[PDB]
Amino acid sequence: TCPFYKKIPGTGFTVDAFQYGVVEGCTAYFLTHFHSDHYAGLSKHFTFPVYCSEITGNLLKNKLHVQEQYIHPLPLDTECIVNGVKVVLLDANHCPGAVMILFYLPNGTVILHTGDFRADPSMERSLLADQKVHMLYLDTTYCSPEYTFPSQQEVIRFAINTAFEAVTLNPHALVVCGTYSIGKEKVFLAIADVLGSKVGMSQEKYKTLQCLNIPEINSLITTDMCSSLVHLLPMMQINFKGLQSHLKKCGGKYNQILAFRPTGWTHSNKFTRIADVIPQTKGNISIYGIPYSEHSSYLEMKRFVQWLKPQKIIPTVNVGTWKSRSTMEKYFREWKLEAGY
Template sequence: MMPLFADASAPSPTKEGEGEEELFPHNGYDYDAEDDALSGVVLLNEEGFPLELAGEDDAKNGAEGSEKTPGKGEFAADFYLCGTDWSCLLPEDCSGSVKLKRGDLVHDPMPSGKKLKQVNLLQIWGLKKNSDEDSFSASSIDYKQSLSGNFDAGDGGGILSGKKSVKAESWESMSRDVQTHSVKSNHFRERMNNGDVNRRSPACPFYKKIPGTAFTVDAFRYGCIEGCSAYFLSHFHSDHYGGLGKKWSHGPIYCTPLTARLVQMCLSVNPLYICPLELNIKQVIEGVTVTLLEANHCPGAALIHFYLPNGQCYLHTGDFRASKQMQDYPLLVNQHVNILYLDTTYCNPKYKFPPQETVLNYVVKITDNHLKKQPRTLVVVGAYSIGKECVYRAISKALKAKIYANASRRRILQAFGWSELSDSLCTNGNNTFLHVLPMASLRFERLKDYLKTYEDQFTAVLAFRPTGWTFNQKIGNHLELIKPISKGNITIYGVPYSEHSSFTELREFVQYLKPDKIIPTVNIWNEANREKMKSYFRDWLRG
């Protein structure tokens, strides 16, 4: 008998929980900002959309005033160019100030503050080529020594003229530090040019590798993985596709057709590397029979079923919401699963979600009742880049309302190829009461500002935050006990609509499959969590 639980002990990741759900609070994957910079991954804006979608503008309507169209040069560019503040090197009562412009030191005659900054973090890290105008080095500072032993910055007597000045030794020390750093940056760039970046890429963890094959699942941020000839993507959420971008060239990417369209459209991956596989169709890849099954997560998400020539069978769930219907999947009925790679986002007994349909009916009921009392209410549903579509579609269908979303989201929704959804979208926020916003926008101040854009049309906001993290044990399935939070004319409901399996659903799924071995893929970095999950798995399989 194979061991029940693979001990996924590993050093703690550099950063936990970046967020496609909240936006990804359950993300247990290694993450480092430098990984993205090295791999050419597309950065996401605060809405969870790839910044490369910025070319399309919304139709001119009331929404423009409240939502920025995502674009290059917003947060990411500002952050990486913001640099390091060295103001402490200047005298406290210096009468002038220094400001940086495109990497050069210039004089600011106004005493508005004392600043001395290295402006380009990419340059510091060696990730951007130095140019004459971007370089910050001792040679770019035009200074001369005065008779008094002080330095002047260029022609105007500048920052160091007057009563206070920086001594020559201070400038010389700064120059030495900058030159030393320049040598280090050049060395790093040389290593990159020579292809010596492997030691900067984190090692691919074992639970992303399929034993007995040359396959990995959701392992794109690890670069070119030794021995891997096929890369599988379970769904289009950034904690799973992280590492994919237009520079991807490490091997074929297998995923569902819907995910394939999003990978090409949003991440600009070369289509030669994208290999779409239809659901429920067996495909033989390098001698292994691979079948993708509906995962009941976000659009395009799939369970990945591997059947090896030696008779071993492995099932990788990616992210999924287990359901009774899955027990009727022919492959799961007829083939014993030896190893189950399990989405354990909510593997905790306190999470016992109500059925999705129950939550949707509740949301529609609350919306209908609210509109009857206050017809001029703007209804907002929080969502991720993809996911939660069922919530606003349920309202749209029941109340016969169009759905407004900004241009970036509309482009993604239309890529699903669902005619009913595409036909229900509208481009002008004034033409419908039903709007979709990023989950992060469901805060009172943001919603208040958003409402101002439509103040001629609406007088109040009713918002829904549909996520499993809002689940309350005391309420359970009694959704009528949910108490919204209100502030003025803004009301927000947290509803336990989850696209991940609850604890009870995980238990039922495992007890149905009875796998020989379970490998959890989420929340594994804490030893206490691993031990708890191990005990749960043992109990489930004994039952």
């Protein structure tokens, strides 16, 4: 059945709750972003109002064929009324089109649902600064102190420098980048930019990127693989067998692959700095795992929560085991005692 952490009390609303059939008492279904664990259940047959960002509404219409009459896109940073309740959508610093949602309940309670987010000090200057938030529905993906990772900018600098050096040493090297969802487009776009190439990809992935309102996108991507030396492939194909096979398909245009797998966290983060990352190599194929995250590190999460000072936290991730739930609740209490709220 629908879990309680997907329901907004005092409303008829749910968040990211499309796989439970008709939810009893739901008058509006919000969708924070276009990732499959969150949209699971949507299709052209859905006939309830869906509230979301413009970009998420482009993907629902073009990729899932949801009918336009049921898609309700809202502008960001703007007070809107939905079924009698004031809401605001805020940028979540996740994937394109991903939002956080502020609900202003009729009784005076204010609720923030973060969806999936990567906390940032810039958020401390949005419309969140303007009033008190009583309850927080929190993306707790990496809520444990082992989870450190570098800034997105440091990771992009590493990838650009690595790729430019490799292709300048060997003009016959191909760069490949893995993907299985929207997000992390900076990785492949930044590498293609330094090399003076467009990114080549399948028709399906091109269609998906053309929904994202990214500026000057017609200048950066293409479905012509032959004209491109940065190729995107399914994350599943980023392994030695998959890559050897791809290289056969390029007809002797290239004699080396340098590939990137933008993972979330990996336990090489506990020891190894970004400056010291090395690839896995077989023959003329090298694979780099780079820690490009679109979720909060532990310290990032902790700073946001100690700034916001919520009265109650409701985790939305890692809620399935008692040991995870108990560990998270111990951290929330530490943060509250350290900061004095």
